[PDB]
Ligand binder design. Structure first.
Ligand code: A1BEG
Ligand code: CL
Ligand code: CL
Ligand code: CL
Ligand code: CL
Ligand code: ZN
Ligand code: ZN
Ligand code: ZN
Ligand code: ZN
Ligand code: ZN
Ligand code: ZN
Ligand code: ZN
Ligand code: ZN
Length: 311
């Protein structure tokens, strides 16, 4: 026999004694070690004392699991552990003061999201995401990336869209204080004003330019081509997206941006960030230039409180 700790959150640990002739699956249920599925594996001697993740099998663990992850999905733990099994093997080099990811397993979109998250103000609601976020900012991002995959219901190797990943992540973050007031001007119908809250207040699809959004954009009306423009914005940042197209990025006019090259779904992302000059982060690779023209699909801008001056 050996003694071990079981857990669902790696915080509340539960002391357990195992029989060395019985696989973990028969004694605990699905059991994992550092992401590795050890369900159908018998206890070893090097396994003495180590802490194992277990799928919740009593009410105490179910409550602990929800409090840490904010999900009751019985598949979440296994998807998380399956991702972690790869992400713990990726490299996370510091590039220009930011934790990036060396290229592997189609992770370019994850590197771009990871880099963006280090440059905008965000509070995640699940303790598991917040804790991993902090550790990620300090260079240890394997767990954060695994969690991103599990929360986005994506698997290692799958082809990911950065805008969609950020949107999923935003939905697990505290964006309640975020507010966007819009005004639509139709010649026949008139003037209608809507207010958005949460994730919808910080994201727009249609143009990369925050200025253009403030000046107004052409959207078809219910009557059938009105104009929508930003009336008031209340958020620490905004994300502007558009299908990839050549675009000029000017130093000091944006926080950071997603560059996307190639075919729909199987292309490659790079990350552009505005520091004292423009830096391009391609996984572990870093280039700099005073101007930038290229195929851009997301642009992030800082914000606090904006009210329009249109009467
Ligand atoms: C890399 C990648 C992975 C997965 C997906 N999926 C998209 C759809 C289908 C499955 C799942 C994930 N989503 C539900 C997309 C891309 C991808 O390539 N995203 C780039 C940024 C992109 C976006 C758009 C676009 C977005 N919205 N509209 C109206 C348009 N248009 C593009 C046109 C050409 C090239 C790139 C484009
Ligand atoms: Cl929740
Ligand atoms: Cl791997
Ligand atoms: Cl890649
Ligand atoms: Cl949540
Ligand atoms: Zn407990
Ligand atoms: Zn929650
Ligand atoms: Zn892998
Ligand atoms: Zn969710
Ligand atoms: Zn109308
Ligand atoms: Zn109308
Ligand atoms: Zn400049
Ligand atoms: Zn890639």
């Amino acid at each position: 026999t050996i003694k071990v700790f079981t857990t669902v959150d790696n915080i509340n640990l539960h002391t357990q004694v195992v029989d060395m002739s019985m696989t973990y699956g028969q004694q605990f249920g699905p059991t994992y070690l550092d992401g590795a599925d050890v369900t159908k594996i018998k206890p070893h001697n090097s396994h003495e004392g180590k802490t194992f993740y277990v799928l919740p099998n009593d009410d105490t663990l179910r409550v602990e699991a929800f409090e840490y992850y904010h999900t009751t999905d019985p598949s979440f733990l296994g998807r998380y552990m399956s991702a972690l099994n790869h992400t713990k093997k990726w490299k996370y080099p510091q590039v220009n003061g930011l934790t990036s990811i060396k290229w592997a397993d189609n992770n370019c979109y994850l590197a771009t999201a990871l880099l963006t998250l280090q440059q905008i103000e965000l509070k995640f609601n699940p303790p598991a995401l917040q804790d991993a976020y902090y550790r990620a900012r300090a260079g240890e991002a394997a767990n954060f990336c695994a969690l991103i995959l599990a929360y986005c219901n994506k698997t290692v190797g799958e082809l990911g869209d950065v805008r969609e990943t950020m949107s999923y992540l935003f939905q697990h973050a505290n964006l309640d204080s975020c507010k966007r007031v819009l005004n639509v001007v139709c010649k026949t119908c008139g003037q209608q004003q809507t207010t958005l809250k949460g994730v919808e207040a910080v994201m727009y699809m249609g143009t990369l330019s925050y200025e253009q959004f403030k000046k107004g954009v052409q959207i078809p009306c219910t009557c059938g081509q009105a104009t929508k423009y930003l009336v008031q914005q209340e958020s620490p940042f905004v994300m502007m997206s558009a299908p990839p197209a050549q675009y000029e990025l000017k130093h000091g006019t944006f926080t950071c941006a997603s560059e996307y090259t190639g075919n729909y779904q199987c292309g490659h992302y790079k990350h552009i960030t505005s520091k004292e000059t423009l830096y391009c982060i391609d996984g572990a690779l870093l280039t700099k230039s005073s101007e930038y023209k290229g195929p851009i699909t997301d642009v992030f801008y800082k914000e606090n409180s904006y009210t329009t001056t249109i009467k």
